[PDB]
């Protein structure tokens, strides 16, 4: 006969380029959005302008 | 600056050619406040002048004189009321700035003044 190498997800090296979680509310949810705020530095010059 | 004396000439020539073609200097000079302040670069400067309320509430970057006052070419600054003979007190008196345009064709000028006065209405 044969068995059947069994694998897991987490065990991979792969998951560390994503974050896992369950919803098990997502079957319900229209879009959703997620926002950001950036701020950029800035440098001070001088003379006329 | 290089070569003024030159550009002051060319200055009188583009004014006199203003007068003749009858597009006159006073529709292409505004006048703005005093100046206190400015930064230079090389040949580029960003003066600073008041346009309302009185000359001393601003404040110069000088340390010497913060305050300013008004400077007049005193060559060019006629007074009226004395001039007119009012018989007047002096007060508080007026300040107009006036030109004088004269039109003969190829022989033009203009003359410039400051004029002070109680007169409202100059006419």
């Given at each position: 006969?044969?068995?059947?190498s069994?694998?897991?997800?987490?065990?991979?090296?792969?998951?560390?380029?994503?974050?896992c979680?369950?919803?098990p509310?997502?079957?319900?949810?229209?879009?959703?959005?997620?926002?950001?705020?950036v701020?950029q530095?800035?440098?001070?010059r001088?003379?006329?302008? | 600056?290089?070569?003024?004396?030159?550009?002051?000439?060319?200055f009188?020539?583009?004014?006199?050619?203003?007068?003749?073609?009858?597009?006159?200097?006073?529709?292409?000079?505004?006048?703005?406040?005093?100046?206190?302040?400015?930064?230079?670069?090389?040949?580029?400067?960003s003066?600073t002048?008041?346009?309302?309320?009185?000359?001393?509430?601003?404040?110069?970057?000088?340390?010497?004189?913060?305050?300013?006052?008004?400077?007049?070419?005193?060559?060019?600054?006629m007074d009226?009321?004395?001039?007119?003979?009012?018989?007047?007190?002096?007060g508080?008196?007026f300040?107009?700035?006036?030109?004088?345009?004269t039109?003969?064709?190829?022989?033009?000028?203009?003359?410039?003044?400051?004029?002070?006065?109680?007169?409202?209405?100059?006419?």
């Amino acid at each position: 006969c044969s068995t059947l190498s069994l694998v897991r997800f987490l065990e991979l090296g792969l998951s560390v380029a994503c974050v896992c979680t369950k919803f098990p509310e997502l079957s319900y949810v229209a879009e959703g959005t997620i926002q950001f705020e950036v701020q950029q530095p800035m440098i001070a010059r001088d003379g006329p302008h | 600056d290089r070569r003024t004396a030159a550009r002051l000439e060319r200055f009188a020539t583009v004014l006199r050619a203003m007068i003749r073609s009858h597009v006159f200097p006073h529709r292409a000079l505004h006048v703005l406040g005093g100046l206190l302040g400015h930064v230079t670069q090389d040949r580029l400067a960003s003066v600073t002048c008041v346009a309302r309320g009185d000359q001393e509430a601003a404040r110069t970057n000088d340390m010497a004189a913060r305050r300013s006052q008004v400077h007049v070419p005193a060559c060019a600054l006629m007074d009226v009321d004395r001039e007119l003979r009012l018989g007047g007190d002096d007060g508080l008196r007026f300040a107009y700035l006036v030109f004088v345009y004269t039109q003969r064709h190829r022989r033009e000028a203009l003359r410039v003044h400051v004029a002070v006065s109680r007169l409202p209405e100059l006419g």
